[PDB]
Design a protein around this ligand. Structure first.
Ligand SMILES: *C/C=C(C)/C=C/C1=C(C)CCCC1(C)C
Length: 137
């Protein structure tokens, strides 16, 4: 199995709560939920090298990384971080995020495949766990 595809969302839990537990105010949460609550996910995987694009009608975000090599991106509440992805187990990867400036509650994300070929995204912030589920288009 592998992660490449244009993945369509079928479930999304607790995205706004991830923002709220990080202290993002209601104004800013409305803007983030409107732009990114239920994005499509496009992945191009070549072994350990990844391109991932999340998109809605109004916002696209793209990252490029290789497992085991540091890269820069932003946390879900918009703070710059340095990220590092590792395989937790076969076809489950976990991204550790370290803030570039100051401190804050821990954030992470995970992408994994189920035995039937669904893609499960987990995002964490403090004690909140957001789950999004996708199938290939
Ligand atoms: C609602 C979920 C997101 C907006 C997740 C975003 C995201 C990125 C912007 C980088 C690819 C990793 C991933 C966590 C899928």
């Amino acid at each position: 199995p592998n992660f490449s595809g244009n993945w369509k969302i079928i479930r999304s839990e607790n995205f706004e709560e991830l923002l709220k537990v990080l202290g993002v105010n209601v104004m800013l949460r409305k803007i983030e939920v409107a732009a990114a609550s239920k994005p499509a996910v496009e992945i191009k995987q070549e072994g350990d090298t990844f391109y991932i694009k999340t998109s809605t009608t109004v916002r696209t975000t793209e990252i490029n990384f290789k497992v085991g090599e540091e890269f820069e991106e932003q946390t879900v509440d918009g703070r710059p971080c340095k990220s590092l992805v590792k395989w937790e187990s076969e076809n489950k990867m976990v991204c550790e995020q370290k803030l570039l400036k100051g401190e804050g509650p821990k954030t992470s994300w995970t992408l994994e495949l189920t035995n039937d070929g669904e893609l499960i995204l987990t995002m964490t912030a403090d004690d909140v766990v957001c789950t999004k589920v996708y199938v290939r288009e």
